[PDB]
């Protein structure tokens, strides 16, 4: 509010840990939870623009969780925790929700995984309609094709 | 009767809140509640739509119960 | 004196509020059939001069592209009582 | 009556007796001299009982409003109110007040206010009628910044000597400890210190 | 300076004091209240109304104790009753319990409170309290008596009366229902019934405040062992008790 | 209607007379107050309306107790009368509690008084804004007191004509220092925004007066910045707007 | 205590020959007291007797006897309350001549004594009597009077329900099932939400009349 | 006809002057919401931080009258400080002359009587603040009494103040319909804060920061305020529910 | 009347209606030279083209503009615009 130090600081750190992104990514294989905590701090800031810039770092990292066929259970939990907390206003998470769906398509993940993750995405965006709507109809359309079979 | 509603909206706990109302201004409250429903993209009148509308265009007078200590 | 959809800055919140009454029943009166209310008619604009109450009118004439009129202030006031009624 | 306060490393400990003589008849012997005029500034009464009690109510009233509008009082700030009320009534009221409190800035502090209305900062103060007898013992065995346990025993030993030599002092020895640890009442029965 | 010492009450040119007419209007914007005097008690009743439904009406008092055997109830403005009842209590104690060492007669107290009103129409920086009070009581010298205090600063004794905005309706109801001899029990049933026609709220004992100055109670006196001394003649009825009487109409 | 006094009140929830009195302050000289980490640096424009005047001899800066500077704008007599009242109040506090009066405490007492004259019709509302603050044991403080009788804590404040230039650059100052600046630094920054606020007073010419109360320069006492150091700031500010 | 618990005896109980016999002599036990708190019980006493059926003659006969003692030394309020009960008893017993005669007699005197919300009831009885005599001209006229009188705010939920009930039934005979249907909804809710003690039965009747309206339409 | 200029009655039976006092409390735009807990009474209120040059910690609307009684004030800040000072003065007076801390019920009534006297003077204008007093007494339990510029007060299960306070009243009322008791049962004071914030968020349709709120909590025999870090923890917990 | 930062939203659209060497330093100055209405934002633009004409420029420089917003504000102190709306 009366201080502008948080705006400056989130940009500095996002820069630093986007050049430490390869170091983090290698640690991610050793402990994905250790790697993830570096980035979480950035999004606990109050600057929605610099939270958006650093949500890009997360989306990149969570390819590894997605690719695996047991780590995406924690991805579903993270989405739920981030949206409820503050939303990092409501801009940052819109781009996050969007970018998980594209990943599921290129990975070729099983019908069962595709179902449950997308089921968690629609449970959460249910009462929301701040811009989730746009994504939300395509997201359900993915379930539909599976449910025809 | 004219409009649709959800059964969460009350009509009858709105009689006491303002007494100096004309009927055209009760036609105003309800017509504005169908505007507020449309900013949601809802086609049934909620009590969020109806009480938000009720509060405005009903101004504040020297007769109303908004200021009351005369009881 | 026509201008873009967003041609008064900051009073953008008032443009959105204006189109609820005007443009949403204009294209489809039918979404209000479900609702069941009297069709939204009538708008009053008031402010301290210089905020583009009229500049907005030129924007909502241009953007919608519907038939537009417009009235001079006092040039639709005649010298005959009830002839100035007939015109309007 | 015997009252004192002594500073110590972590705060200030207060010591008093509970005997109050009118004549040779002790009006009450369980009567607490340790007075709350603020949550962390307490005071000790001596002299004519009414006059000290009257002022202490007036100071509690004035420090309540002080805390709610102007920030908290320090031990100093409290002592001055006592001083200035005694100063207008130095011909009519006689009061002995020892004012002790723990601030967290300057730590535990002792101000004493004689019968005329003056304030003096001291590391220890003694007042009353029984504390004139223990003056030399107090200055000699007083150590600055002792332990909490050593301060408690220190005041116990001085006031046992006060009770030995004063008939107006007696009853139990009451203590209030003002610290960061809180406000801890202690009480000492006469068998415990007639030995100590 | 502060040159307000000139009265804010002034005669009107067709007679009558304009300021107290204005205050009498304030009585008819207020709640309704009534008093029926029985021959073995008095019942007084009023309606409770709230500024919010989140406001408690179990902490709302519009019937107040002046002395133990004497109660008051108002119609008009809340604020104007609130200070003035305190002044009624005050003058009973300064001038008859510090001089005559006992609780004042009902006649006497009513007169003293009209003096307080009278100096609120005199001088600047004051204006009359815009309430009428019913002062029901019992004294040991004039029996039961029921009074109405005017914002004029006049009083009249009554046998049954009403005040408030629904006063005219209430006293016409009471016209047929009053008899030379009454029971206190019948008095209560009439009181709630009369006030049913003048209350637009609920008619439960939650929202109807009922109090009797009926027979005295020596178990509310707070001590026992002087038979000679008598306890409160007043008894406020709590909400459940008022409901029992609603079924007994 | 609804300005005939101040026991009139409007259906607008405004008092008109009191809003009108803020316009007297808008006709005053520019005055600023910068809240620093370790103190406050006040500065006030003193117009040279004639070469007849005697420079740095007409103070708008009157000290209260020893550590509270008070400087104002608007109607100069009314503000000097306000500060006379508060010097009596400062003395009473020192009497009773044997300590200098704190900054929050001094503010409260002034605020009741100015608040009282906007209720009485026997005493005329104020037409001053005062900027006052200092250093006591509870920190540095800065307060701006409206003629309506409102105050707040401030990281920067201004009043007068040329508050338009001053206020903006204090948003950049917080943005320079979101953890404030040194008392030393604020000498040259209080001077600098009187010289930028001399563009709402560029009809005339002016004399800079500067005063401070800070822990690290004067020891939490209010003193005047005088001599070579006042002149060093004037040389700094002078270059910025050129 | 003594008269209150004796009516508990009476209410228990079943329709019995002893119960019948007991009640016109229970007004003798009522007068024995000489107390003025008879008023409160005497209404409930009669109310209990009505509730289970106890033979044509006896329920009218008892109620008639009470009315005599409700003007002997008692209030006009008590008397008039019992007249409202007497009039309803005659209607059920299917005397419309004895019902109408009484009704005309009541209502006119209490316009000198008008302060009464109890004539609202008398209007609604009057409508029912005319309806079953099969004149709708003056059933409508009294029903209109009853609506006007209840516009003033003192009326119980029961009282508003009764007004809705007759209004609906009148309009069906006028061959308009739109306006009848509107009253049967609000009448229905009154009985549905008023706790069942005789209300279960009327709620059933009103539901059928709601449904009837939509068949015609 | 001056019945709008001085404090005399009109032929409407109303003092217009007095009504205008209520129309000033909606102009500063401070909303408050107050609920009674099971061991606490919690009041959360807006803090308007308009500029970067206001220090938000000194921006106040919560004045601590006594040791146990906070007061939240809705309406102009000059009148707020005058009222806070008066309320404090009388409470200290009461402790001094009767030998115990002033109850909340009686404090509401004392300020109500002086506000009525300020509508009885024609040279002293009433203070245009609506005052809410929150406490936990040990003689009345958790309590709320709200006084107004007329001199009227009443007890409250819960209360709200401000321009949009009608919206708040609805939410609270529903909450007490379900419980069917006049206070929230929850033994942690922290979760009563969380409930209070939920009802405010529903009413105003706005999510809050730590410096958009200022919170006071009266627990048993102490009144304190939450600092800005502590408020953020409560707003984090809204999501956890 | 345009809000503190409703003036700012007009400042970004009317500066693309002029030429500049580059000006994106509105935010503080316009906020604190408040008093304007929406028509007075475009008179600050025209007045920055009068300070330009003195210097002999065909651009709006922020050196031109921030003397403009100071001057447009001062002439508007001439009379209030005090209105009380429902
Ligand atoms: N909001 C604005 N943004 C940009 N230009 C504006 C704005 N308002 C006014 N102007 C400029 O001023 C001209 C005239 O103003 P306009 O007639 O639009 O104002 P108005 O608010 O409707 O005033 P009034 O209430 O006196 O009719 C516009 O055509 C435009 O050039
Ligand atoms: Mg125009």
Describe this structure in words.
The PDB classes it as motor protein. Keywords: Proteasome UBP6 Ubiquitin Allostery, motor protein. The entry is titled "26S proteasome Rpt1-RK -Ubp6-UbVS complex in the si state". Chain A is 26S proteasome regulatory subunit RPN5. The structure is cut from a larger assembly and holds nine protein chains of eight kinds. Helices cover 77% and strands 0% of the residues of chain A. Chain A is built from nine helices and no strands. Chain A has helices spanning 5-19, 21-30, 32-40, 48-61, 63-67, 72-85, 92-107, 111-125, 132-148. The radius of gyration of chain A is 16 Å and the shape is globular. In chain A, 19% of the residues are buried. Chain B has helices spanning 26-40, 47-55. In chain B, helix 1 packs across helix 2 (47-55). Chain C has five helices and no strands. Chains in contact: A-F, A-H, B-C, B-E, B-H, C-I, D-F, D-H, E-G, E-H, F-H, F-I. Chain E binds chain H through residues 2, 4, 8, 19, 21-23, 25-29, 50-60, 77-80, 82-83, 86, 120, 124-127, 130, and chain H through 3, 6-14, 105, 109, 112-113, 115-117, 119-124, 145, 150-152, 154-160, 169, 172-173, 176, 182. Adenosine-5'-triphosphate (ATP) sits between chains C (1, 8, 49-55) and I (10, 38-39, 42).
Question: What structural keywords apply?
Answer:
part of a larger assembly; 9 chains; C: 88 residues; mainly alpha; G: mainly alpha; binds adenosine-5'-triphosphate; binds magnesium ion
Distance between the termini of chain A: 54 Å
Termini Cα gap of chain C? 24 Å
Largest interface comes to: E-H, 36 and 39 residues
Helicity level of chain A, as a percent range?
A: over 70%
Class derived from helix and strand content of chain A:
mainly alpha
Give the strand tally of chain C: 0
Q: Which class of secondary structure composition applies to the elements of chain C?
A: mainly alpha
SSE succession of chain C: HHHHH
Number of helices of chain A: 9
SSE series of chain A = HHHHHHHHH
- Put simply, the count of helices of chain C is 5
Share of β-strand residues of chain C: under 5%
Query: How many strand units of chain A?
Result: 0
The helicity of chain C comes to 25-40%
Sheet with the most strands, sense and barrel status of chain C: none
Pfam families (chain D): Proteasome
Active site (chain D): 1
Keywords (chain D): Acetylation, Cytoplasm, Hydrolase, Nucleus, Protease, Proteasome, Threonine protease, Zymogen
Subcellular location (chain D): Cytoplasm; Nucleus
């Amino acid at each position: 509010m009366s201080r502008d130090a948080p705006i400056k600081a989130d940009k500095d750190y996002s820069q630093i840990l986007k050049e430490e992104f390869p170091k983090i990514d290698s640690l991610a294989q050793n402990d994905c939870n250790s790697a993830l905590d570096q980035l979480l701090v950035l999004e606990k800031k109050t600057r929605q623009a610099s939270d958006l810039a650093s949500s890009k770092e997360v989306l990149a990292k969570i390819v590894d969780l997605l690719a695996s066929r047991n780590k995406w259970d924690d991805l579903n939990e993270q989405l739920t925790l981030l949206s409820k907390k503050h939303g990092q206003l409501k801009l940052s998470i819109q781009y996050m929700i969007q970018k998980v769906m594209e990943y599921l398509k290129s990975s070729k993940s099983l019908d069962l995984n595709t179902r449950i993750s997308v089921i968690e995405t629609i449970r959460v965006v249910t009462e929301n309609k701040i811009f989730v709507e746009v994504e939300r109809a395509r997201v359900t359309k993915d379930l539909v094709e599976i449910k025809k079979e | 009767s004219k409009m649709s509603l959800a059964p969460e909206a009350d009509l009858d706990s709105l009689i006491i809140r303002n007494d100096s109302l004309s009927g055209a201004v009760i036609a105003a409250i309800m017509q504005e509640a169908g505007l507020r429903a449309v900013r949601k993209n809802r086609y049934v009148i909620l009590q969020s739509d109806l009480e938000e509308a009720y509060a405005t265009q009903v101004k504040t007078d020297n007769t109303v119960d908004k200021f009351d200590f005369y009881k | 004196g026509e201008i873009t959809f967003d041609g008064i800055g900051g009073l953008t919140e008032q443009i959105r509020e204006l189109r609820e009454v005007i443009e949403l029943p204009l294209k489809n009166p039918e979404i209000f059939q479900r609702v069941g209310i009297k069709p939204p008619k009538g708008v009053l604009l008031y402010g301290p001069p210089g905020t583009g109450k009229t500049l907005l009118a030129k924007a909502v004439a241009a953007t919608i592209g519907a038939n537009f009129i417009f009235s001079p202030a006092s040039g639709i006031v005649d010298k005959y009582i009830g002839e100035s009624a007939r015109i309007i | 009556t015997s009252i004192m306060a002594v500073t110590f490393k972590d705060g200030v400990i207060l010591g008093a007796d509970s005997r109050t003589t009118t004549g040779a008849y002790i009006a009450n012997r369980v009567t607490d001299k340790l007075t709350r005029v603020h949550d962390k500034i307490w005071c000790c009464r001596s002299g004519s009982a009414a006059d000290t009690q009257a002022i202490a109510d007036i100071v509690q009233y004035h420090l309540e409003l002080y805390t709610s509008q102007y920030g908290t009082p320090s031990t100093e700030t409290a002592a001055s109110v006592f001083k200035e009320l005694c100063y207008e009534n130095k011909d009519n009221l006689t009061a002995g007040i020892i004012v002790a409190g723990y601030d967290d800035k300057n730590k535990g502090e002792v101000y004493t206010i004689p019968l005329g209305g003056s304030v003096h900062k001291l590391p220890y103060a003694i007042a009353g009628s029984g504390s004139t007898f223990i003056y030399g013992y107090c200055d000699k065995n007083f150590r600055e910044n002792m332990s909490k346990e050593e301060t408690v025993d220190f005041i116990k030993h001085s006031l046992s000597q006060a009770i030995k030599w004063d008939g107006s002092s007696g009853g139990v020895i009451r203590m209030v400890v003002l610290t960061a640890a809180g406000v801890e009442r202690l009480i000492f029965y006469p068998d415990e210190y007639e030995q100590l | 300076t502060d040159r307000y010492s000139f009265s804010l009450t002034t005669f009107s040119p067709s007679g009558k004091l304009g300021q107290i007419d204005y205050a009498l209007t304030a009585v008819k914007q207020g709640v309704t209240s009534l008093g029926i005097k029985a021959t073995n008690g008095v019942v007084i009743a009023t309606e409770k109304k709230s500024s919010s439904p989140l406001a408690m009406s179990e902490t709302l008092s519009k019937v107040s104790l002046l002395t133990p055997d004497i109660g008051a109830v108002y119609s008009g403005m809340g604020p104007d009753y609130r200070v003035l009842v305190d002044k009624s209590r005050k003058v009973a104690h300064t001038s008859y319990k510090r001089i005559y060492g006992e609780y004042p007669p009902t006649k006497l107290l009513v007169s003293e409170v009209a003096k307080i009103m009278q100096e609120a129409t005199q001088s600047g920086g004051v204006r009359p309290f815009g309430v009428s009070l019913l002062i029901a009581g019992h004294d040991e010298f004039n029996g039961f008596s029921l009074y109405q205090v005017d914002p004029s600063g006049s009083y009249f004794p009554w046998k049954a009366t009403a005040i408030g905005k629904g006063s005219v309706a209430a006293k016409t109801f009471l016209e047929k229902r009053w008899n030379d001899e009454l029971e206190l029990e019948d008095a209560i049933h009439i009181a709630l019934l009369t006030l049913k026609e003048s209350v637009e709220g609920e008619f439960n004992g939650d929202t109807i405040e009922l109090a009797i100055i009926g027979d005295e109670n020596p178990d509310l006196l707070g001590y026992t062992g002087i038979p000679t001394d008598k306890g409160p003649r007043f008894r406020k009825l709590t909400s459940q008790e008022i409901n029992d009487r609603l079924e007994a109409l | 209607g609804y300005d005939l006094s101040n026991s009139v009140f409007s259906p607008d929830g405004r008092n008109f007379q009191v809003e009108y009195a803020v316009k007297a302050v808008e006709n005053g000289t520019t005055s600023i107050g910068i809240k620093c980490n370790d103190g406050v640096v006040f500065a006030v424009e003193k117009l040279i309306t004639s070469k007849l005047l005697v420079p740095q001899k007409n103070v708008k800066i009157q000290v209260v107790d020893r550590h509270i500077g008070c400087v104002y704008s608007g109607l100069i007599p009314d503000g000097r009368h306000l500060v006379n009242r508060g010097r009596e109040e400062a003395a009473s506090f020192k009497k009773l509690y044997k300590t200098p009066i704190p900054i929050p405490a001094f503010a409260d007492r002034l605020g009741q008084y100015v608040q009282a004259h906007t209720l009485y019709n026997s005493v005329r509302p104020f037409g001053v804004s005062t900027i006052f603050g200092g250093v006591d044991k509870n920190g540095a403080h800065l307060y701006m007191l409206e003629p309506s009788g409102s105050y707040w804590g401030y990281k920067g404040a201004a009043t007068g004509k040329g508050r338009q230039s001053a206020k903006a650059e204090l948003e950049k100052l917080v943005d320079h220092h979101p953890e404030g600046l040194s008392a030393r630094e604020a000498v040259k920054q209080a001077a600098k925004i009187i010289y930028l606020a001399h563009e709402d007073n560029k009809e005339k010419d002016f004399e800079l007066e500067i005063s401070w109360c800070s822990l690290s320069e004067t020891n939490g006492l209010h003193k005047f910045v005088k001599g070579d150091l006042l002149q060093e700031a004037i040389d700094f500010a002078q270059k910025e707007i050129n | 205590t003594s008269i209150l618990e004796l009516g508990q005896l009476y209410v228990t109980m079943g329709a019995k020959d002893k119960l019948r016999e007991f009640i016109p002599h229970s007004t003798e036990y009522m007068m024995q007291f000489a107390k003025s708190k008879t008023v409160k019980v005497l209404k409930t006493l009669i109310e209990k007797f009505e509730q289970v059926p106890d033979s044509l003659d006896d329920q009218i006969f008892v109620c008639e006897k009470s009315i005599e003692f409700a003007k002997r030394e008692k209030r006009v309020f008590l008397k008039h309350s019992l007249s409202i009960k007497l009039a309803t008893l005659h209607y059920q017993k299917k005397q419309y001549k004895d019902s109408l005669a009484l009704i005309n007699d009541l209502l006119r005197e209490f316009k000198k004594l008008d302060d009464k919300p109890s004539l609202v009831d008398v209007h609604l009885l009057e409508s029912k009597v005319y309806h079953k005599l099969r004149n709708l001209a003056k059933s409508k006229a009294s029903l209109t009077a009853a609506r006007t009188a209840a516009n003033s705010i003192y009326c119980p939920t029961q009282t508003v329900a009764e007004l809705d009930l007759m209004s609906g039934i009148l309009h069906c005979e006028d061959k308009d099932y739109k306006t009848a249907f509107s009253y049967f909804f609000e009448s229905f809710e009154s009985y549905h939400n008023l706790t069942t003690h005789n209300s279960y039965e009327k709620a059933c009747q009103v539901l059928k009349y709601m449904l009837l309206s939509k068949i015609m339409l | 006809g001056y019945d709008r200029h001085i404090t005399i009655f009109s032929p409407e039976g109303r003092l217009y002057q007095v009504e205008y006092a209520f129309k000033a409390t909606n102009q500063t735009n401070i909303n408050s919401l107050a609920v009674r807990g099971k061991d606490c009474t919690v009041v959360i209120s807006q803090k308007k931080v308009p500029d970067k040059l206001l220090d938000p910690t000194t921006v106040s609307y919560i004045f601590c009258i006594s040791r146990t009684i906070g007061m939240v004030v809705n309406g102009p800040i000059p009148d707020a400080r005058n009222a806070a000072l008066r309320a404090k003065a009388e409470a200290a007076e009461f402790r001094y002359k009767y030998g115990y801390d002033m109850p909340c019920d009686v404090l509401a009534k004392r300020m109500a009587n002086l506000s009525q006297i300020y509508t009885q003077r024609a040279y002293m204008r009433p203070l245009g603040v609506i005052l809410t007093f929150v406490s936990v007494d040990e003689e009345l339990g958790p309590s709320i009494y709200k006084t107004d510029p007329a001199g009227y007060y009443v007890g409250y299960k819960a209360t709200a103040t401000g321009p949009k306070q009608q919206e708040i009243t609805t939410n609270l009322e529903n909450h007490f319909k379900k419980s069917k008791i006049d206070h929230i049962n929850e033994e942690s004071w922290e979760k009563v804060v969380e409930f209070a914030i939920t009802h405010m968020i529903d009413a105003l349709g706005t999510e809050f920061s730590k410096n958009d709120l200022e919170v006071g909590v009266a627990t048993k025999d102490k009144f304190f305020t939450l600092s800005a870090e502590n408020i953020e923890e409560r707003l984090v917990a809204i999501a956890e529910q | 009347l345009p809000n503190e930062a409703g003036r700012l939203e007009i400042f970004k659209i009317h500066t693309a209606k002029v030429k500049k060497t580059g000006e994106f330093d509105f935010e503080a100055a316009v906020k604190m030279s408040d008093g304007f209405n929406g028509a007075d934002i475009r008179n600050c633009a025209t007045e920055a083209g009068f300070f330009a004409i003195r210097d002999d420029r065909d651009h709006i420089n922020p050196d031109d503009l921030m003397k403009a917003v100071r001057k447009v504000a001062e002439v508007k102190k001439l009379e209030g615009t005090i209105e009380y709306q429902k």
